[PDB]
Symmetry: D2
Subunit: 268 residues, 4 copies
């Protein structure tokens, strides 16, 4: 009797076992969901990592910048879940922004080619994925994407913040399309999490100053959050995504759910 008992859910974006998608996949499986996983580029590492999940799940290659992978996606998914079966949920946990547009590099020094790559992957692909999977989604279904609140500017996140603003707008339009299928589309706006790029920044990959800025932001986050914020725990975010994948938020669409300890509602 799990929250997602007998639901067929596609989960994208696992790279390491600290990926927000890894935790979403683990909680979904714990709550009775049957998963299809998608991975990018390093499918060998991804397979080794997905083998650690509580249950076996098919892993499919998906480069959201590749038109062939998107055109074949629904077919490859149907083959994995069985003919006659459709998805009940889709998790978009894909995001990237080159070093030139996120970190220490001046906001004015990011080349458009880099910004465009970041927007393609982090924002446009949310619509690309919905276009590919809505035809194989069941009514009452749910599409969830990952957001980082871009309503206020901040140090370091620069063009990744700009990409999240674009993602928020995309989600509102994806909801209009998803609604025709009786499917909801929402974003979970998470507080900062120590994933691959974040452990690299804090670790000094982009220099001391960038590392410091991130740590200061993580500190302020926990201060402002009335229930606190642990940047090392992705489980509260994973649980929130599963809530949206469930039938317990049935009148919420084109929306943003904040899993950030309540930090965005507090000034100081």
């Amino acid at each position: 009797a799990g929250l997602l008992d007998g639901k067929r859910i596609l989960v994208s974006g696992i790279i390491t076992d600290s990926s927000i998608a890894f935790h979403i996949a683990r909680v979904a499986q714990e709550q009775g969901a049957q998963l299809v996983l998608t991975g990018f580029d390093r499918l060998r590492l991804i397979q080794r990592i997905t083998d650690r999940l509580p249950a076996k799940a098919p892993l499919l290659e998906l480069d959201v910048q590749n038109e062939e992978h998107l055109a074949s996606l629904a077919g490859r998914v149907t083959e994995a879940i069985g003919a006659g079966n459709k998805l009940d949920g889709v998790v978009h946990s894909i995001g990237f922004m080159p070093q030139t547009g996120m970190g220490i590099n001046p906001f004015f020094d990011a080349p458009y080619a880099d910004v465009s790559k970041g927007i393609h992957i982090s924002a446009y692909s949310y619509a690309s994925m919905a276009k590919a999977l809505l035809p194989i989604m069941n009514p009452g279904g749910s599409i969830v994407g990952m957001d980082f609140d871009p309503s206020r500017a901040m140090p370091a996140y620069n063009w990744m913040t700009v990409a999240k603003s674009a993602l928020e707008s995309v989600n509102r339009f994806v909801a209009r399309e998803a609604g025709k299928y009786g499917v909801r589309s929402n974003l979970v706006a998470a507080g900062p999490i120590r994933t691959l790029a974040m452990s690299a920044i804090v670790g000094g990959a982009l220099g001391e100053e960038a590392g410091a800025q991130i740590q200061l932001l993580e500190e302020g986050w926990d201060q402002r959050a009335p229930i606190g914020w642990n940047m090392k725990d992705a489980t509260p975010v994973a649980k929130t995504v599963c809530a949206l994948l469930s039938d317990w938020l049935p009148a919420t669409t084109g929306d943003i759910i904040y899993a950030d300890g309540g930090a965005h509602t507090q000034l100081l």
Copy 2:
């Protein structure tokens, strides 16, 4: 098993079987929650209406404008749930605005005495209730209040909209306090529901013009909502409240969850 299995939840605001609180109580009971109910003024009719719920629940009198009722509340609740037991959830589903500040009456013609009564009941009582019940709430607990999106002005709702703007602010401060107890505080912003005052307005209690305004509002709500909006169905709102009472939104506090069909995200 049930979503709220073994949770002790206080549910305020049942007046008829159309009340949003009646549906919250029913869904909570369906999901394994042990309830304590509070009612105002006409307790014998409230008892006759709470008798229609799937399970028996103690009914306690609570006039949020009465200081004695608030000062004795925690003691009376403890007596009902048993010594040594605490609440895991609190539902504030209380709202009122006199006819002079809600309906057809010009916005400029509402006397402050009437506006103050509406703000006391609809907004201030959210803090009053939290103050009384937080000392008897368990960590991981949840306080949920009912909101009606006041970010844009609209016909008829007038001072009730003003009261909801005040309630939104109260929630953000109640979260600061509830956080000290490891308790979350949130509002569910529902779409229009045909409850007591709503069916009276539409039915022509305040005249034809007011009735027509509400109906035109309801129609536009359903149009804008990508998944539609049934103003006769409180169950999607009830399910959203239960989601917040559950452990599936554990990093959300001082916030607003929209159970409105996604109408507020769409211009037209």
Copy 3:
């Protein structure tokens, strides 16, 4: 030729020469406006302060909690500006919240009588003033009120923040009424300024902690503001109010203009 050349403007809220209203009145007079001033309680004291303004202006008593003062207001204003003449602008720079709802006192310890008084004066009176003066306002006219951003909760401001949330909602409804007269209604959301109450708090009136809280908030405000913030200079706020009183923002109504150094747009 001034920005407000030949405009008849009513300015409320001067108590000292530190008052935001005193600076609004001074800049308006510098820009060619003809003023009518309103004051509360100690009118012989206010008259000594208004005597410091660049030009002579009639001073009229107005306690916004007094129904007789409001009912006679338009008549008393017309008598001061001359029969046949109407106001082109109205400045609401009135705000109060008792110590129990603003300062160090716990948020839960503010009695409703005190909260209601602050909401009556700081929020409801904005509508009261519009009701009284719109019949004696010229098309193209402007009503400006003073706001302090309540969108995120913060230390110390407590129920005054709740009152500002209610004021923001009142402004949106006053704009609906003002539109019938071809009059705009807007709020200027100012950053913290050292006025009577703020100076008293910083000086230790509510104790050492309350003092320290205001200063930390002031410090962070200047940090977040990309152009800085000086809590001792009300002139940038006064200039913004005059911009709204002018014909240079003619398609802005039911809105909020932030004169806060851009702090509310920055997280850190």
Copy 4:
């Protein structure tokens, strides 16, 4: 004494005498500003259009997608205004979205190459322009961009709405940079105006359905706006831009000023 008397302002984005930039340029010149104009692609035509302005102004070529144009921009501007002189204001009134991302074309059918072109021109170029002109801007200066409220999804505007969401984020970061120079950066969110593309859609260029959708959007805009909205009058928008270019909004940065008749503050 003009509102911008003795100010040196760069105005981009004139294509026809219907362009919002044409009206901004006209009002600025009426208010004593000395202008430098930038145009894209058809310079011979733009020159004939700029010749209808109240005063002569140098016209410079600027394709925001061309890196040579941006690298030489400040030098070419300095040559036009005279050595030793700097700009006091910059107007970004540049926007474009291919037919595939704006109109009747399904939201999911816009190729990323087209979306990327639209985001480059409508959003990224705001930062590009600031990067190029901030070194030749005087303290107290102002950068103004043109926005179309993207906070709610709507018919037809599709990916142009997505680009405006990105622009709003770019503005907040441009403000951080501009602040180092004592320069403000803001957006004017205008209501729908009958400029080149808007006349073409309404006129049936993309078919009847698209034409009808814009007209129902225009109708609802006027209805919602408490002071009405005339989609044929760009002067109220032009006046708002000039207000921001002036010294009358000196504590406003990273922000959005709505010149939309107040429509965004009203639901119905």
